[PDB]
Amino acid sequence: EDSLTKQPEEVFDVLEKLGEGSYGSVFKAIHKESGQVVAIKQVPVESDLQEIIKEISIMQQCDSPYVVKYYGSYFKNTDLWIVMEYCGAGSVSDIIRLRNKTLIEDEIATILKSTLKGLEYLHFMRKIHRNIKAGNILLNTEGHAKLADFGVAGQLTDTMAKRNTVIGTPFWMAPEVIQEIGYNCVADIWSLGITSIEMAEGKPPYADIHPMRAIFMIPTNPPPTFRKPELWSDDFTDFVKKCLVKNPEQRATATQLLQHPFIKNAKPVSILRDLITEAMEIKAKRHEEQQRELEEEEFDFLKNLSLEELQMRLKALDPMMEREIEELRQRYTAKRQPILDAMDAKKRRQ
Amino acid sequence: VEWDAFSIPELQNFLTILEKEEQDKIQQVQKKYDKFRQKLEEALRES
Ligand SMILES: Nc1ncnc2c1ncn2[C@@H]1O[C@H](COP(=O)(O)OP(=O)(O)NP(=O)(O)O)[C@@H](O)[C@H]1O
Ligand SMILES: [Mg+2]
């Protein structure tokens, strides 16, 4: 608790940036004291503090190797610092994105084996994730899958902001969620089922279709399958069928899905080691490849910058303006091109 | 938009608005580059 009273920068050495979403930037960091690598997100306090903290209170009360561990918080320069567990390999969605390759069954089974463990843990505590998907399953540098970015109770009937953002992306929603406007534990199993297809095909069923249309299909049509079912085993195929059961009372629970062959006969997490190294390696190759690009064709970087690379940017600062605002003058000549072409005609008619 | 539907004075109001928007963003970047010199320079003073 004493380390919580100290200022953030004095406890952790923040390293490279890892990315972002819609509420701030995520960063890599190292605990100076124990050397245990952690993550640090930075959110602007000005933008709805209540919503951020509600998620914080839900994650902090979770204690599972399958749920991303939350450690603490600080306050620094209008930014609320959130210290999270470091999942180096990123989300399942990011890994599939980075390599430009879908996941093989064995890879899927292992990931699902721990994802199921997390769901079971949650559901047993009578909690609900309310928002399972590939993008919210995180793998660390070792190959251990973890549940993150939880949904929150009443996220459907909360006025307009979240009563509308969830509606916009209903591809992982169970049928009874659309018809009941609520969630049951088994809802996550359906989401898991869809997430299973998401990992094999790269995107969920109906993903490319207009939401409004999906909202109508999901509770009407029969559960989705693989666009090419021959490429997948019978254990895999069957497992999916057991998850995507429209009747929530006939839908397998997390406790039961752990007994299914596809999962029970899953490989160790070491099989992810290889797909994880490629992802992380490419993540590094992009990092260095991109850092050499932004450095060529050109309140922290200046403190970490050298005298001669600081004096030459200042000198090459004006040339960057003539190209910055000459583009703006070209953009607005385009916007006014129609209005002038129209005025041309009207000046010819009178 | 079917700009052929408007009149000369109306249309003129639109060119004016787009120009008023342009100048306000050309000057938004100038305030960005002039807050950047004042920091690169103040940093040179720390060397
Ligand atoms: N602890 C972590 N370690 C390594 N990478 C992480 C960690 N946390 C998040 N990331 C990655 O950084 C990305 C951006 O994080 P985030 O700001 O939460 O955006 P997002 O989660 O994808 N969108 P949202 O679900 O609405 O929060 C995530 O998608 C992860 O891929
Ligand atoms: Mg997140």
Side-chain angles (χ1 to χ4, degrees), chain A residues 333-343, chain B residues 3:
Chain A
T333 293
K335 282 190 171 186
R336 290 192 309 251
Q337 194 60 87
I339 300 183
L340 291 174
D341 198 336
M343 282 184 64
Chain B
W3 302 101

Side-chain angles (χ1 to χ4, degrees), chain A residues 18 20-21 23-24 26 39 41 84-88 91 94 136 149:
Chain A
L18 297 184
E20 51 184 334
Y23 304 94
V26 167
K41 192 181 187 180
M84 217 162 55
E85 173 172 12
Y86 183 70
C87 306
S91 69
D94 289 328
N136 296 334
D149 296 327

Side-chain angles (χ1 to χ4, degrees), chain A residues 299 301-302 305 307 310-311 313-314 317-318 320-321 324-325 328-329 332 335-336 338-340 342-343 345-347 350, chain B residues 3-8 11-12 14-15 18-19 21-23 25-26 29-30 32-33 36-37 39-41 43-44 47:
Chain A
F299 288 11
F301 59 94
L302 293 188
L305 185 62
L307 174 151
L310 190 150
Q311 285 176 350
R313 292 180 183 182
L314 185 60
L317 185 148
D318 287 276
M320 267 183 61
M321 191 173 70
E324 186 102 347
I325 74 177
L328 224 64
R329 289 178 184 276
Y332 276 64
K335 282 190 171 186
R336 290 192 309 251
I339 300 183
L340 291 174
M343 282 184 64
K346 296 298 176 64
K347 287 183 180 186
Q350 288 184 8
Chain B
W3 302 101
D4 305 274
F6 296 86
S7 69
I8 284 98
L11 289 174
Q12 182 59 296
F14 295 87
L15 295 179
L18 282 172
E19 292 178 30
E21 186 186 359
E22 185 187 24
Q23 306 298 40
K25 284 189 179 175
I26 279 182
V29 56
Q30 285 178 353
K32 174 171 63 178
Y33 281 145
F36 193 45
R37 282 199 209 88
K39 294 297 171 180
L40 278 188
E41 198 171 340
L44 290 163
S47 296

Side-chain angles (χ1 to χ4, degrees), chain A residues 17-28 37-43 55 68-69 82-95 97 131 133 135-141 148-150 283:
Chain A
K17 167 172 168 136
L18 297 184
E20 51 184 334
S22 299
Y23 304 94
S25 294
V26 167
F27 284 87
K28 180 187 180 186
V37 179
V38 308
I40 293 177
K41 192 181 187 180
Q42 292 170 346
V43 305
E55 196 188 2
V68 174
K69 305 175 191 301
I82 301 176
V83 183
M84 217 162 55
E85 173 172 12
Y86 183 70
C87 306
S91 69
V92 174
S93 187
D94 289 328
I95 292 168
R97 209 195 71 249
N131 195 35
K133 51 183 298 185
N136 296 334
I137 292 176
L138 304 180
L139 284 173
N140 65 18
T141 59
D149 296 327
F150 282 44
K283 210 169 191 173

Side-chain angles (χ1 to χ4, degrees), chain A residues 269-280:
Chain A
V269 308
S270 62
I271 69 161
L272 305 168
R273 188 187 183 183
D274 282 29
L275 73 80
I276 274 154
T277 298
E278 297 174 20
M280 291 191 309

